[PDB]
Paper text:
SOCS proteins such as [name] are negative regulators of cytokine signalling of the Janus kinase/signal transducer and activator of transcription (JAK-STAT) pathway. They contain a central SH2 domain that specifically recognizes phosphorylated tyrosine residues, a hallmark of cytokine signalling. SOCS proteins also have a C-terminal SOCS box that comprises a BC box that recruits [name] and [name] (EloBC) and a Cul5 box that recruits Cullin 5 (Cul5). [name] has been shown to bind GHR as a substrate for ubiquitination and thus drive its degradation by the proteasome.
During these investigations we found that, having been soaked with the small molecule solutions in [name], the diffraction patterns of the crystals could no longer be indexed with the same space group and unit cell parameters. The change in unit cell dimensions and space group represents a six-fold increase in the size of the ASU, thus containing six [name]:[name]:[name] complexes instead of a single one. Experimental phases for the structure of [name]-treated [name]:[name]:[name] were determined by SAD using diffraction data collected at 11.8847 keV to 3.1 Å resolution. The 12 unique arsenic peaks were confirmed as sites of cacodylate modifications on cysteine residues. The six complexes in the asymmetric unit were refined against a native dataset processed to 2.9 Å resolution. When analysing each component of the [name]-treated [name]:[name]:[name] structure in this alignment we find that [name], [name] and the [name] box of [name] are well aligned (average RMSD of backbone atoms = 0.62 ± 0.25), whereas significant deviations are observed for the SH2 domain of [name] (average RMSD of backbone atoms = 2.1 ± 0.9). In all cases the chains of [name], [name] and the SOCS-box domain of [name] are well aligned, with low RMSD values, indicating these parts of the complex form a rigid unit in relation to one another. In contrast the range of RMSD values for the SH2 domain of [name] indicates a significant degree of conformational freedom between this domain and the remainder of the complex. The ensemble of models found in the [name]-treated [name]:[name]:[name] structure reinforces this observation with the substrate-binding SH2 domain of [name] alone exhibiting a clear hinging motion relative to the remainder of the complex, consistent with the computational predictions. SOCS2C111 therefore forms a highly ordered contact that may explain the beneficial effect of the dimethylarsenic modifications to the growth of these crystals.
Residue numbers in the entry:
A (entry chain B): 2 to 104
B (entry chain C): 16 to 45, 58 to 112
C (entry chain A): 31 to 134, 149 to 198
């Protein structure tokens, strides 16, 4: 098992599957939630994109480095008409500064 | 259902498994939910805790630590009280 | 006042998430067998004289150290630990908390949780690790009260 958050723009999806599952299978799971197809979706780990045939483990996801409490981020970008859009992620809110009481 | 939607106070959309969101006793009371009081940096953590909690119920495995940064602790406390979890 | 103090101590103990109740020695041993040195938990003591026991991982293996509750106070088993070198506590969590901190003598580190604690509690733990002054926190009165109920860092 491996736990991850799939992110595009302001959207973020929490799910999981086998470390041995394929990037296409993950794309197919996105189709069950967001209703777009696998061939019109491009995934990514940080900056580098992913291959449909490789396992999530082969992509470097491992149970060790993508656990429930700290699930790994997976980039996502849609097929803009006759091309693909630039993978973009809206950052999360910024926390306040700590009060002096909490050192 | 299979999934549900949670929208932070600053608009971020978070989608989680149906039974994961049932961790929050407040959420169990009601496919989409808006949170005007809870920002995205806090609500993202609340989704992580759901993964954690469900994963480590009746656990043959050792339950690991759920790290919380001091900066979010105060807001996460208020949220976690809000959500009953 | 013996009861009042015991009841409270047990109320706190239930809040920890590492009080395993009627766990056995062989159950504690199998649980802690491969866990990290210093991993600990508390369970009921089978012995007539003792109320609770600390079951902890050591380089040797999982072992047990008992807790006396006599005359309204807790302390570690004075047979194994030198009585002259023993502090006393009105709370068994306070006792454990005190020893967790000191070794940053008895090596306790992280508790082995029976089940995932609440997020509210998990925050309470983080918050308490930063500060003692609860009164001076940007929080409503009910949340401040929650933090009062369990002051500890573990």
């Amino acid at each position: 098992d491996v736990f991850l958050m799939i992110r595009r723009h302001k959207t973020t999806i929490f799910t999981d599957a086998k470390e041995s599952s394929t990037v296409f299978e993950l794309k197919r799971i996105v189709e069950g939630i967001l209703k777009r197809p696998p061939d019109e979706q491009r995934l990514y780990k940080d900056d580098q994109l992913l291959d449909d045939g490789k396992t999530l483990g082969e992509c470097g996801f491992t149970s060790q480095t993508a656990r429930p409490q700290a699930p790994a981020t997976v980039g996502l970008a849609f097929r803009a008409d006759d091309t693909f859009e630039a993978l973009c992620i809206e950052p999360f809110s910024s926390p306040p500064e700590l009060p002096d009481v909490m050192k | 259902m299979m999934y549900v939607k949670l929208i932070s106070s600053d608009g971020h959309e978070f989608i989680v498994k149906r039974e994961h969101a049932l961790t929050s006793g407040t959420i169990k009371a009601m496919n989409e939910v808006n949170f005007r009081e809870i920002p995205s940096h806090v609500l993202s953590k609340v989704c992580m805790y759901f993964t954690y909690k469900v994963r480590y119920t009746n656990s043959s495995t050792e339950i690991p630590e759920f790290p919380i940064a001091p900066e979010i602790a105060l807001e996460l406390l208020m949220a976690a009280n809000f959500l009953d979890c | 006042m013996q009861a009042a103090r015991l009841a409270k101590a047990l109320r706190e103990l239930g809040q920890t998430g590492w009080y395993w109740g009627s766990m056995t020695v062989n159950e504690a041993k199998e649980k802690l067998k491969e866990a990290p040195e210093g991993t600990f938990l508390i369970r009921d003591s089978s012995h007539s004289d003792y109320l609770l026991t600390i079951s902890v991982k050591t380089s040797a293996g999982p072992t047990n150290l008992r807790i006396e509750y006599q005359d309204g106070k807790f302390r570690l088993d004075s047979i194994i630990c030198v009585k002259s070198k023993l502090k006393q506590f009105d709370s068994v969590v306070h006792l454990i908390d005190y020893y967790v901190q000191m070794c940053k003598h008895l090596y306790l580190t992280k508790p082995l949780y029976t089940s995932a604690p609440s997020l509210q509690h998990l925050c309470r733990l983080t918050i308490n690790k930063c500060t003692g002054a609860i009164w001076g926190l940007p929080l409503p009165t009910r949340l401040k009260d929650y933090l009062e109920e369990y002051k500890f860092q573990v």
